[PDB]
Subunit: 115 residues, 4 copies
């Protein structure tokens, strides 16, 4: 499991369920190419985005579609989406978990990098 | 300013106004003695809690009454309050800003300490 | 599993391992009585604090011993501990997860309440 | 002040000084056009990015160059930058403060919007 995304809802105190997540990898010409995507589960998690073979070193962007999430709950949001941009490095630990905690006008994101 | 408290509302993207704050200082007998209190202004800031003279070395607890804030807005939140516990002035006088960012089921708190 | 605690380290991007956690329940005379305690595991989680039978409605305090955590890593911290105070209510969902994200001068805490 | 950016360092408990910030605005062709840039002062604040006249309705991206900040301090962080993407001024002019709180493997961002 090279890359996992976990999302929490700070207003309801719950996993953020059915949130669209898009992962991109930066191409040689500096454009962002679609890499993987999915929707978070009932546990707020998104598994199976990629494989060890495909997840090579490079610069990745994870876009979490927070605006649509809040709108589906009838709550007025600030951001278009939450964005997490990072370099994958083979030097460090092998599993990346991108965690996000969502409020209508604020979010935090943390990388948990483990073996 | 020896001690300032600032509170923001992450649902509205606004200062958190009229938030009650109580400060305690640990006494010689290990009990929490009342030290100062007040409420946040329209800027979400609380000034004038204490003075350079009165704000001696000690262990302090800043209780931010988040439940009363949310309930006055007609919201049922998770926490009773946010509690911020820290040693102050152990290396001489510092200026402390205790900030808090509030959501119904989550909060963050940060200290900014200047010499 | 009525109550679980999960702690993350924002500096290292890792679970916060071997963090002491103390849970208290408020007594009739307003004092805090020890209720349960433990240390977080290699995954940053603390399971088995209590049982459904013992975890009755009431006001609880969870103290996460952040100062000792940072000192064991050789990093200079601000807070004595992180404190999470809440009322357990049988009305809502049945499992409480108290999550905390730690930095030397800041922390956030979120309640994830699920069935 | 139409747009202000404020950055804090959660390791030091201090303003984050000399942080580069780039603002982009989505153009008619869907590309991110450069809009304004600057760097945070000793207060961790960045003023004077734009004007009431120039800060028209649009989708804006505030890129906060967190990796360069940490590397200038001799630290290897996780993220490339923190990106804050939002529609502005769609209901008339507002004053936006975009705040960010930085840790090597985590950040939080909050918008405070006033009329």
């Amino acid at each position: 499991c090279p890359l996992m995304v976990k999302v929490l809802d700070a207003v309801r105190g719950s996993p953020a369920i059915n949130v669209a997540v898009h992962v991109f990898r930066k191409a040689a010409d500096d454009t962002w190419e679609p890499f993987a995507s999915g929707k978070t589960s009932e546990s707020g998690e998104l598994h199976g985005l990629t494989t060890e073979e495909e997840f090579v070193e490079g610069i990745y962007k994870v876009e979490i579609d927070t605006k649509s999430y809040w709108k589906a709950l009838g709550i007025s949001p600030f951001h278009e989406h939450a964005e997490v941009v990072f370099t994958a490095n083979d030097s460090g630990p092998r599993r990346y978990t991108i965690a996000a905690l969502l409020s209508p006008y604020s979010y935090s994101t943390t990388a948990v990098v483990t073996n």
